[PDB]
Structures are given as C-alpha cells and as structure tokens.
Design a protein around this ligand. Structure first.
Ligand SMILES: CC(=N)N1CCC(Oc2ccc(N(Cc3ccc4ccc(C(=N)N)cc4c3)S(=O)(=O)CC(=O)O)cc2)CC1
Ligand SMILES: [Ca+2]
Length: 223
C-alpha cells in the first residue's frame, strides 16, 4: 500500500496474510472456514494467518491455519486477469472474536465515487521497494468505468473495477494482492493488478467481488 496509513493492530479483523514461509498475498476471511483471495495468488502450501498486525512478530492474537483446499475460479484467465478470485478453505475453523472476524459479502455492486478501504502488507513505495511489517490501509474511491478504461492499456472487464487516485501517490501494490477492498462494510473487491504502483493515471484494479457471490456461496456450500 503506497501513500496509505498504518491501520492499527487488528482494526481490519477480516484481513488475512497468506504465508508460504513468508507473507505473499492478502486475503479476506468471509467465514470461519473460508478465505477469499486472488487467483493470481494461487500456490500450494498456503498457511492462512489471521489476527495479524505485525507479520514478523508474534503479538498474541494470531491464528495460523493451513489451507486444506484452494479453488481458483473456474474461468480465471491469468493472461487477462479476468475472474481473479480464489477460495481457500481452512483445515479448521478460525475462532471468531473482535480481532478475527469475517467480512460480509456484498448484495449489490458498489458504484463509482464510493469510498473503500484497501489494506495489506504490500510495498509502500511508488518507486523502489519497502515492505511494512504492520498492516497498511488506504481509503480510495471507486473510479468510473470510463476512467478505468482510459487509464489502462489492458483489456478491462466487467469483473474488474478500478479504484484510487489518478494523480498518483496512493494505491495498492505488490504484496497487497488478494487483499480486501471493503466499501460500506461489504467486501466489494480483491486487490488484483495495476500498472506499477501509485503512478499517475494508473489506478489499481480490483476483482469485482459482487459478480462472484453466487459462485462463492455455492462453492462454499458444496465444499
Ligand atoms: C490486466 C492484465 N492483463 N494483467 C495484469 C497486469 C499484468 O500482470 C502483472 C502481474 C504482476 C505484476 N507484478 C507487480 C504487481 C503485482 C501486484 C500488484 C497489485 C496491485 C497493484 C496496484 N498498483 N494496484 C500493482 C501490482 C503490481 S509482479 O509480478 O510482482 C512483477 C515482478 O515480478 O516484479 C506486474 C504485472 C499483465 C496481466
Ligand atoms: Ca504477528
């Protein structure tokens, strides 16, 4: 997260760190046994880390739980990033409390202009790299489809939205991948991709989670 702020320990209780020996992606706890993340974060040997603030220090509220199953969206396209969403089932249910909490799935898509909270342990620099150990947060408005389209050399789909600030300086970044974009208490987005980080006219792109609610509920129900 570039140009954001330190969230505060466990102020984003649905935020998860996916760990394969090191933090590699964020994700969002959507119930006691399931995490949603980006399909581009897929890899084997995932441990889900809940209750994290400082990902390098055991501070007493973590729950570490290995994934028993990952399910990349059936139509995830890694070339176009279409359908960049993955579900991860935990080997055992997380214990939910104030510091570990699920985030609600949306029932309606969010509209342009809506302010959202994006969080993660991704790179904090627009040029070069510095990775924070505590969770970073950024409030960013969803941008219009027209400006998202104008802002990207890549084909954008209806399963993506962009959010951020065209003037640059504030954006998600590498390492925030898979993490939540929450708008009005609903998980509306997943950190998906961007061209560089926090560059002028290059806003972050996010998987439009409201489009996947049926797949998500059906997949969880059947697994
Ligand atoms: C839309 C599309 N067709 N895509 C997505 C973009 C591109 O794929 C990628 C995927 C990953 C990267 N990486 C950077 C990267 C990764 C994740 C991000 C998440 C958000 C944001 C943002 N600003 N909100 C920028 C990000 C930039 S990379 O793999 O780490 C390159 C490397 O190895 O150093 C760079 C390009 C090509 C495929
Ligand atoms: Ca910790």
């Amino acid at each position: 997260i570039v140009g954001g702020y330190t969230c505060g320990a466990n102020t984003v209780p649905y935020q998860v760190s996916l760990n394969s020996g090191y933090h590699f992606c964020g994700g969002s706890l959507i119930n006691s046994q399931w995490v949603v993340s980006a399909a581009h974060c897929y890899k084997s040997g995932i441990q889900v880390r809940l209750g994290e603030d400082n990902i390098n220090v055991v501070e007493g509220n973590e729950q570490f739980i290995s994934a028993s199953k990952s399910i990349v969206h059936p139509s995830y396209n890694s070339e176009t990033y279409n359908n960049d969403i993955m579900l991860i089932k935990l080997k055992s249910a997380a214990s939910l409390n104030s510091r570990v909490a699920s985030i609600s799935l949306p029932t309606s898509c969010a509209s342009a202009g809506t302010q959202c909270l994006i969080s993660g342990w991704g790179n904090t620099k627009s040029s070069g790299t510095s990775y924070p150990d505590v969770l970073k947060c950024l409030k960013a408005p969803i941008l219009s489809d027209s400006s998202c389209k104008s802002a990207s050399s890549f084909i954008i789909t209806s399963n993506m939205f962009c959010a951020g600030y065209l003037e640059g300086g504030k954006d998600a970044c590498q390492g925030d991948s898979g993490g939540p974009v929450v708008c009005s208490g609903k998980l509306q987005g997943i950190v998906s991709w961007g061209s560089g980080c926090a560059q002028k006219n290059k806003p972050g792109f996010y998987t439009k989670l409201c489009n996947y609610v049926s797949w998500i509920k059906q997949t969880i129900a059947s697994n």
